[PDB]
Symmetry: C3
Subunit: 480 residues, 3 copies
């Protein structure tokens, strides 16, 4: 019945964290705040799969490029999505259309102007081109119809469609611009033609501009593509005496709020996520991720960090208060049941025992600390990526300034928060051991000699009931 | 046996704060960092009332839709307020060029003066100035037209070419509006303007545009298959604007001399105007701006607290209320003293002359000063500027609308996280600071008493000698004369 | 009786810092985190000088305003506040802000004759297209990169000219369209009331119609010229067709663009200096995380803040708090201890002296160094041109850009101020802790062999010569 010692837990962990004052501190346990892995797959968002376009891009898909789902939560293109406008020309407000199609709750392709009945006095079946070939034969977009002259004339046409659905209708069409005056007259039998498209909101007149242009996909002519959204009850009216690439199929749809487009090598799998990146889906529980800036969903904040680890356990030794790695030089691998505690020796035996009160209080506090760093992060469904055309460089650079500024803010705060919390956590453990030592010293008083390494040497016999009284608050100083 | 004890203040407060290590800690006093209420009113900003539009929107008001009052007495405004029932706009259908840009540029004005740029009765001697009305723009059951525009038509079988200029001698910018009529058919074009091919030309030193009517049958909107597109420009002081046309001009009648204010915006609100002033207006009502954070609304106008999703941001200033790093408070000094009323930390003694409490004023006042500097830094370091958060985009600017949302949502996330974690960290430090001050007060006494007193272990010392009132005072004074005893 | 005391360093430093609990604490040493000065110079970014325009703006230089000099690569463009030579013939410059942005950084750049003046336009007058609105040296002149064709011998034949981009780079092609003030001038110049201009490539496709109208005079001209441009990709062809009103390309530019730079408006002057961050006032050092010189920087820059002082204490509070030692039971500091931060003063029969505790001081120096390095080195930055230019119909974009910059300004100012306050409080508590722990190490090492005096000193009950004193300072004292 000579001694009782205060000490702390150690184990065989080789985890390291950084603190304010020192790098690479080995600790008994740590927790990761940084999502640093992905599953390499395209997953469902809001329980709905993406639209995978594969070899096609949105232009090729929506026009019906011959080489190219009721709902989708985002759109996925590949880096080999090259099938788009097979006949060359300009696609009006293309980036805006991509954004507006990025999520739809309902989607239905339907024959807006039935090919065989809408155009009685035009040739409806020879508007094909080698620029739009499929299976070794010349073809054309499957959603448009290239009307041409019949029996030496191209009569004026006047065709309307009233959206009598309960949804928006996306209508697409084109205007052909021949390379020379001879092609104009062969196809449309007049030199000066017009195309007119009007709705309640849309109002435009197009005039073919004939010019010899550098050949693209073998074509010196051009076809410009146009679209509008018809609200329920609205009417669209087409009028032309030439050069019209008429709607054949259109799309009734309900647009979803705010998604986006991913360019990715990943393929779809049976997985659900809250956050999709171009590399793959990631978990959304942690506050930070270093996978990719251009995510879609309710996502961790993107950071440039490679490591964000919070210590939960102790400095591992198999601070401000001078106890841990101070006057108590090392930890106890033999104390397996807690963080701080006792070792004793008397005539009845020896052994380690954790102080459960201080241990459990400290566990509760460290768990509340980690939970706060994680759960205070507020998130919303956001599609980070944005697309800008060659005449929107200023907007593209403003968007980048926004993404990069957020990246800089979150990287700095996340790194410094982890360093600061890790410093506080080790001082907290140091304080708890220090306060445990003083509780014992103040009970024992002059009935024991302080050795100076955390241990006390009793001047009387301290049996097991006496030892238990010291771990309890109730040591009976005068009784000895 | 005579005794002296070290202790700390407790009261009947039920304030709670959160810390890093523990939630819902009851404390003796705390302060709020979050503006969480509004007054439900539209208030003046920079001392100037907003422009209230009511049943009209900006298009209806600025063109002079006959259902919109002219409101000619308002010379200035600091922001614009529309209601969700602001439905009177372009009564004759058509496109309003750069409408969102115009709304943004009209959102605050230092001075504003509607004046007759082209007097109806003398500017158009060879055109009809009296038949340009429409049932689409009716008022009081009769056909009418915009009060600031003039729909000229042919007179005596002809619509001669017109050539009209205006020199801006108002020493301010002049906002000029006009329209171009696009008839539904060729018969109406010839009826109104007596020629199939007409043009409108509008030129200044910086503006230069030519308009040609586009004749086509459109689906009827407000009964009209024709269309009217609306256009505007800001004419700089001293510059000249020249209109030339041989048909289809919806000519300016009234224009606006104005001095634009810098960077305000438009609010959509059910709230009504009151005789109140604010530094920060939200769509539900005005909020105070002394505190760094607010959770009322993201789309504020003025010098505003930062928007956060937090519901509670309370900093403890006082102590753990018990009616940790240093082990004194809720440690070896188990509870506080509701009887010590005069400070945060102090003493209780008992000798033959009596017993009682006494606060240590030096440590208390030093702690009050530090906590005050702490709270002031959290509040006063917030830099703010006059900003109108909200932005409006048309149906072909969805990418811009979403970029704007990404900015607003990103700031919301940054400020919510940083505010929550800052309060947690400050609260933990504040409680550690109090704990330290009590511990250091205890050690100052223990080191003077040395072995002339027995440590009990609950903050108290038991003297081995008689410690009269002068002896007690010397201990609190620091000037205890150990050799004497 | 012999004595050893524990104490801490003091000096003659007048540096002050702010802490959480108190302002204006005098400390023995501190480090600055805020760039508050510049060198008043325009320096090279990425090792490449800027393009200085001086009296000219980008329109005047790219079109070849005759008061503008013709020039090659650059990392950013510098305009002066006196840059007032642009389009000397009045008109509209299509997508001018876009062009300014896309020209702001180029890795190669060369002016070349795309359509030789002397032989490209055989049946037009090529040498009388000058105007008093573009005078130089007392004579009517014109842009040096464009050619104002006019009728010859009573007609302006149709023209039909193409250029194929064989340059293995993009080619910037500029042109204009003339809109005369009246029909007499239209006929005199172009012998034609109604003309057309057509310009087409693989990407570009536009047709221009001259509009005749009376307009208020600008630089004496009631006519206008509108200016246009496109980027011709390698291997592509541009084709011009017209029967009037064409201000034809004469010189164009083969160029390779660089990534996102911008334009600085500056009173500063070029010098032979390199920088990583350029402000309109001058170049700034980019080692520190924060700067208060200017919001609109170009390069890899410190974050812009409103702060006027961001000093971190590294040393001790200077006395010539959580742990109660510094300015506590050890009331003041020792200016006589010159070799470290914490240490000893002894006195015995052999004399007196101060000696730092080297183990304590070195661990503290390493910790404080790591603290300062983390605040500086964790700052992530990228090459960014902050400034943007918007025209008069882009005020919403201008205000959104301002909301971005002001938002970042408020975030970084608040965080930097509060970070420094918190770091400084912890640094001062760290030093306090280190002095207390050193004091306790000696106290428990001596136990009842010495008496505690109360000021950090112990009085020995026995003779403690120099070896004895050394054993205490070394930890090897044997009671
Ligand atoms: C759909 O996408 C595929 C893949 O991009 C397109 O196939 C590619 O078509 C181009 C143009 O026809 C081919 O390039 C050309 O090849 C010929 C060979 O005779 C050469 O003479 C031309 O100078 C040029 O290099 C390309 O090789 C071909 N790639 C593959 C893998 O087949 C296809 O044309 C697209 N189809 C539609 C309808 O959009
Ligand atoms: C290049 O930039 C210079 C600097 O602004 C231009 O010179 C300025 O030209 C204006 C217009 O010619 C001058 O203003 C005028 O003075 C005359 C009488 O001298 C008066 O009739 C006008 O009403 C106007 O007030 C101005 O004095 C002159 N400034 C200087 C410093 O010379 C120059 O025109 C530009 N040249 C080109 C080709 O861009
Ligand atoms: C914070 O703690 C206080 C004090 O315990 C809580 O208030 C008491 O909670 C008990 C048990 O739920 C109730 O019986 C009492 O009526 C509560 N007191 C009062 C004044 O309401 C309080 O609910 C806690 N708050 C949070 C958010 O945890
Ligand atoms: C001003 O706004 C009112 C309300 O929006 C318009 O009122 C309606 O007119 C339409 C068609 O003219 C009717 O279908 C509605 O029933 C009317 N609502 C009523 C009377 O409450 C009014 O036309 C607008 N006037 C102008 C000039 O814009
Ligand atoms: C370390 O301890 C863990 C837990 O007891 C055990 O899994 C492992 O085998 C031990 N030895 C190592 C990792 O070498
Ligand atoms: C197109 O046909 C409809 C059907 O009645 C007719 O009302 C309309 O006037 C026609 N459009 C034109 C321009 O004639
Ligand atoms: C896709 O894979 C190829 C080949 O490994 C690689 O070069 C390319 O960068 C990848 N792209 C994406 C978006 O992952
Ligand atoms: C341990 O201490 C508590 C009070 O802190 C007391 O109620 C309990 O009886 C003690 N246990 C023993 C075995 O004495
Ligand atoms: C607490 O005491 C103050 C003393 O003035 C009193 O005003 C208040 O009502 C009390 N509050 C409670 C909850 O008892
Ligand atoms: C703003 O503060 C004043 C005085 O502190 C107060 O009277 C008013 O109620 C506050 N306004 C709101 C909306 O809470
Ligand atoms: C106005 O009242 C309606 C009634 O439901 C409500 O939905 C709306 O949020 C209120 N505020 C605004 C700004 O419309
Ligand atoms: C108490 O402290 C003050 C502070 O300097 C001192 O002047 C005084 O002499 C001390 N003693 C008494 C009895 O006041
Ligand atoms: C302070 O001391 C340093 C080093 O001893 C010396 O260089 C400096 O001149 C001194 N300053 C003053 C004001 O005495
Ligand atoms: C800070 O303290 C020094 C030392 O007396 C003084 O000279 C200086 O004016 C003080 N500054 C402020 C802002 O109080
Ligand atoms: C321009 O020249 C090319 C080649 O000589 C020719 O093919 C083309 O038809 C010409 N354009 C016109 C409008 O004559
Ligand atoms: Cl552990
Ligand atoms: Cl903590
Ligand atoms: Cl209080
Ligand atoms: Cl801290
Ligand atoms: Cl603090
Ligand atoms: Cl120093
Ligand atoms: Cl620290």
């Amino acid at each position: 019945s000579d001694t009782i010692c205060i000490g702390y837990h150690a184990n065989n962990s080789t985890d390291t964290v950084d603190t304010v004052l020192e790098k690479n501190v080995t600790v008994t346990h740590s927790v990761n705040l940084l999502e640093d892995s992905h599953n390499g797959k395209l997953c469902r968002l809001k329980g709905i799969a993406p639209l995978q376009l594969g070899k096609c891009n949105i232009a090729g898909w929506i026009l019906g490029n011959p080489e190219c789902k009721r709902s989708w939560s985002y759109i996925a293109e590949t880096p080999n999505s090259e099938n788009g406008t097979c006949y060359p020309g300009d696609f009006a407000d293309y980036e805006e259309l991509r954004e507006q199609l990025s999520s739809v709750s309902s989607f239905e392709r339907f024959e807006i102007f039935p090919k065989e009945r809408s155009w009685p006095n035009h040739n409806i079946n020879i508007g094909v081109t080698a620029a739009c070939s499929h299976a070794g034969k010349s073809s054309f977009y499957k959603n448009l119809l290239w009307l041409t002259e019949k029996d030496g004339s191209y009569p004026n046409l006047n065709k309307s469609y009233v959206n009598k659905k309960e949804k928006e209708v996306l209508v697409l069409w084109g205007v052909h611009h021949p390379s020379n005056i001879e092609n104009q007259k062969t196809l449309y039998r007049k030199e000066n033609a017009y195309v007119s498209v009007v709705s309640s909101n849309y109002n435009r007149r197009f005039t073919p501009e004939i010019a010899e242009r550098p050949k693209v996909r073998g074509q010196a002519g051009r076809m410009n593509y146009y679209w509008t959204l018809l609200e329920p009850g609205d009417t669209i009216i087409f009028e032309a005496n030439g050069n019209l690439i008429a709607p054949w199929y259109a799309f009734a749809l309900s647009r979803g709020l705010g998604s986006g487009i991913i360019t990715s090598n990943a393929s779809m799998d049976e997985c659900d996520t809250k956050c999709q990146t171009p590399q793959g889906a990631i978990n959304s529980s942690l506050p930070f991720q270093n996978i990719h800036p251009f995510t879609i969903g309710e996502c961790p904040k993107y950071v440039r960090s490679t490591k964000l680890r919070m210590v939960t356990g102790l400095r591992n030794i198999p601070g401000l208060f001078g106890a841990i790695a101070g006057f108590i030089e090392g930890g106890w691998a033999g104390m397996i049941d807690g963080w701080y505690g006792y070792h004793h020796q008397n005539e009845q035996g020896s052994g380690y025992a954790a102080d459960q009160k201080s241990t459990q209080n400290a566990i509760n506090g460290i768990t509340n600390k980690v939970n706060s760093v994680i759960e205070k992060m507020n998130t919303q469904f956001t599609a980070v990526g944005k697309e800008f055309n060659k005449l929107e460089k200023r907007m593209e650079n403003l968007n980048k300034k926004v993404d990069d500024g957020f990246l800089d803010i979150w990287t700095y705060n996340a790194e410094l928060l982890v360093l600061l919390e890790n410093e506080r956590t080790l001082d907290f453990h140091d304080s708890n051991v220090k306060n445990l030592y003083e509780k014992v010293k103040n009970q024992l008083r002059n009935n024991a000699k302080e050795i100076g390494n955390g241990c006390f040497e009793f001047y009387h016999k301290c049996n097991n009931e006496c030892m238990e009284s010291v771990k309890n608050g109730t040591y009976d100083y005068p009784k000895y």
